[PDB]
Write a protein that binds this ligand. Sequence first.
Ligand SMILES: *[C@@H]1O[C@H](CO)[C@@H](O[C@@H]2O[C@H](CO)[C@@H](O[C@@H]3O[C@H](CO[C@H]4O[C@H](CO)[C@@H](O)[C@H](O)[C@@H]4O)[C@@H](O)[C@H](O[C@H]4O[C@H](CO)[C@@H](O)[C@H](O)[C@@H]4O)[C@@H]3O)[C@H](O)[C@H]2NC(C)=O)[C@H](O)[C@H]1NC(C)=O
Lengths: 101, 101
Amino acid sequence: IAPCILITLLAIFVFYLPPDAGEKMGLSIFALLTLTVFLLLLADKVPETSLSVPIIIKYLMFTMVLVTFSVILSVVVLNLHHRSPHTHQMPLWVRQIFIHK
Amino acid sequence: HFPFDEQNCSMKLGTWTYDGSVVAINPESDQPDLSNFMESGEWVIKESRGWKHSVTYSCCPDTPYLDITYHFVMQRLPLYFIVNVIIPCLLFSFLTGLVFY
Ligand SMILES: *[C@@H]1O[C@H](CO)[C@@H](O[C@@H]2O[C@H](CO)[C@@H](O[C@@H]3O[C@H](CO[C@H]4O[C@H](CO)[C@@H](O)[C@H](O)[C@@H]4O)[C@@H](O)[C@H](O[C@H]4O[C@H](CO)[C@@H](O)[C@H](O)[C@@H]4O)[C@@H]3O)[C@H](O)[C@H]2NC(C)=O)[C@H](O)[C@H]1NC(C)=O
């Protein structure tokens, strides 16, 4: 539980990392790799029946989904950041929402 | 079809040293008795049935060999394998295509 909480905290803190550092992908994806290691840890302990899902497995899969979405949204942010000005024209509504409001 | 696989496991029972001419075995009922069966957390018994079979070999035309074969058709409960195996694979497969963005 405590390693999962720490990994979740790092997944949160990825979004404060500046795009110019070039380190969002490494942090988020290594968090996912660590969570896979903890899945391997749990593989030897959890029950093997199929009538319901253990709550710890639910928490682990919730954490993995969170880290996956952190990777996805970091990719989206980097796509916006590294967008070529001459090839890509900013639509006006993007300006009104994300620069003014 | 694992983890959505259905099995059909039989139990052949017979008098090892006595042939049908000296000992005859007959089923008590058409089906195995599941009155005191404990519910499994990984399999569901869809069907069950016992069949009596008499076989005469060419070398032994006067000593038929009898058996009773109880078969159990079982359908796996796939929730454990869906949650623990398939969902992480789906997450990795979805993350695979994000590199092109
Ligand atoms: C899972 O796997 C098991 C095998 O391990 C299957 O069991 C077979 O089930 C079928 C029926 O579904 C059995 O066939 C039936 O055999 C009966 C007995 O025949 C034997 O005994 C006589 C007398 O000694 C011999 O002459 C004969 O050669 C055999 O040795 C028959 O009485 C049955 O006839 C009835 O059904 C048929 C078909 O509907 C009708 O036409 C007849 O009129 C009559 O109503 C029938 O033939 C078979 O023998 C079983 N095998 C074994 C080894 O047990 C399961 O069916 C299978 N489950 C699924 C869902 O796939």
